[PDB]
Write a protein that binds this DNA or RNA. Structure first.
Ligand SMILES: [Ca+2]
Ligand SMILES: [Mg+2]
Ligand SMILES: [Mg+2]
Length: 430
DNA sequence: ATTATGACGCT
DNA sequence: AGCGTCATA
């Protein structure tokens, strides 16, 4: 009863940009705005691979992980913007720089955790307390939440979408007790007010729209964010969790979309997150391990304790290229030329990083794939990174992988390399 | 022949 | 350390 933790101690938001690389290209090129359009990398093989898709184009069935030639079959008028190519490879700098624009704006409101190139978690607990003291028991107007959905509402005793949103918001606000500064539901609501403000600032100052989730932890905030995309935000209360989870496939929860989640389904013979509540913590620990078991036991009740890490910058800076099929690297000179291309991009990004962020990488990771191997990576070796010099780094990379060459002739490389990867890691302040 | 990333867990 | 898992555009 009185001692049961309910995981309602924090207010956490997740802000995720809508169709992000497409918006970056639409800002740059007004001809692409309000169009079915997608961002593609490379072109020769099946028109290139789509990696981002506008919502207009999604209506035709266009997705990421789709070849452009196939997308054009679904949507003949699809517009395409190409990822930049530099030194023979795709170069994502424009999107990384647009990411920094958004992350720096979010950072004005609170400490953020960069979770990907286009999303960040926000711990709003302290900001919410401060907004609550200024409000002085004053009710929260629906006008302060113009793009907010309350998950699970309306319920109980119109046929248009915005109408339903307002109905749900009205029921939520009608029920609130603004008299209590420690009320979790009130805290979430104030969190949502702040996230409206954050999202408005992002759009005003960058031109980019985003969605967001507001809840009591990262997993629920992430889940909430996706419930109403694009250009909307969703509040998932603690109380909404039993109904939400009662029909929620396990794979939808972050970290359960792979083998672990499949094993939860198979071993326990269940389908939905809510069904996990019927197992003891020890039962779940027995199947999935101590850490996963405890995490699942709490998570299926809406409780999760992973902190929002104060980290706005990536911890690693990497450069990767595949050499598929016929294009696999089969000569020493090929291998060395591409290691140099990768190293030159890496040096460029590292030198910029040192100037911007007052740090230096100290370790170079070199990874390759070899033709035939099912695995992403066949081999990963580290060596010292002591100077930001591309020729040194590429020479060093060649040295750590040189003996992977089964070839009796040193000029040839066998089995041919289908991937090269250079990654700078282990930063120190500088 | 999605590709190019990037974080965190295991032993 | 090197490998694996899961996740992003
Ligand atoms: Ca996004
Ligand atoms: Mg995202
Ligand atoms: Mg996406």
């Amino acid at each position: 009863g009185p001692h049961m933790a309910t995981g309602q101690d924090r207010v956490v938001a997740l802000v995720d940009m809508d169709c992000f690389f497409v918006q970056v290209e639409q800002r740059q090129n007004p001809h692409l705005r309000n169009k079915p359009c997608a961002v593609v990398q490379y072109k020769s093989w099946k028109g290139g691979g789509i990696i981002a898709v506008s919502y207009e184009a999604r209506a035709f069935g266009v997705t990421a992980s789709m070849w452009a030639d196939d997308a054009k079959k679904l949507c003949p008028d699809l517009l395409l913007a190409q990822v930049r190519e530099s030194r023979g490879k795709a170069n994502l700098t424009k999107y990384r720089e647009a990411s920094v624009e958004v992350m720096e704006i979010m950072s004005r409101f609170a400490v953020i955790e960069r979770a990907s190139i286009d999303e960040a978690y926000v711990d709003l607990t302290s900001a919410v307390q401060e907004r609550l003291q200024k409000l002085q028991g004053q009710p929260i107007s629906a006008d302060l939440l113009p793009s907010t959905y309350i998950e699970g509402l309306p319920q109980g005793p119109t046929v248009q979408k915005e109408g339903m949103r307002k109905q749900g918001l009205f029921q939520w606000l009608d029920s609130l007790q603004i008299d209590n500064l420690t009320s979790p539901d009130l805290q979430l609501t104030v969190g949502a007010v702040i996230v409206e403000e954050m999202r408005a600032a992002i759009e005003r100052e960058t031109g980019f729209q985003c969605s967001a989730g507001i809840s009591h932890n990262k997993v629920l905030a992430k889940l909430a964010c996706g419930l109403n995309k694009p250009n909307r935000q969703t509040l998932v209360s603690h109380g909404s969790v039993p109904q939400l989870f009662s029909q929620m496939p396990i794979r939808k929860i972050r970290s359960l979309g792979g083998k672990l989640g499949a094993s939860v389904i198979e071993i326990l013979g269940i389908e939905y997150m809510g069904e996990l509540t019927q197992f003891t913590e020890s039962q779940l620990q027995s199947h999935f391990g101590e850490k996963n078991g405890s995490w699942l036991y709490a998570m299926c009740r809406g409780i999760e304790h992973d902190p929002v890490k104060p980290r706005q910058l990536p911890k690693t800076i990497g450069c990767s290229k595949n050499f598929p099929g016929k294009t696999a690297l089969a000569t020493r000179e090929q291998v060395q030329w591409w290691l140099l291309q990768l190293a030159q991009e890496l040096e460029e990004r590292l030198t910029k990083d040192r100037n911007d962020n007052d740090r230096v990488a100290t370790q170079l990771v070199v990874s390759i794939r070899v033709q035939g191997d099912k695995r992403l990576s066949s081999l990963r070796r580290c060596c010292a990174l002591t100077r930001y010099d591309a020729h040194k780094m590429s020479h060093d990379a060649f040295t750590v992988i040189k003996n992977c060459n089964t070839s009796g002739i040193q000029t040839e490389w066998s089995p041919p390399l289908t991937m090269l990867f250079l990654c700078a890691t282990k930063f120190s302040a500088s």
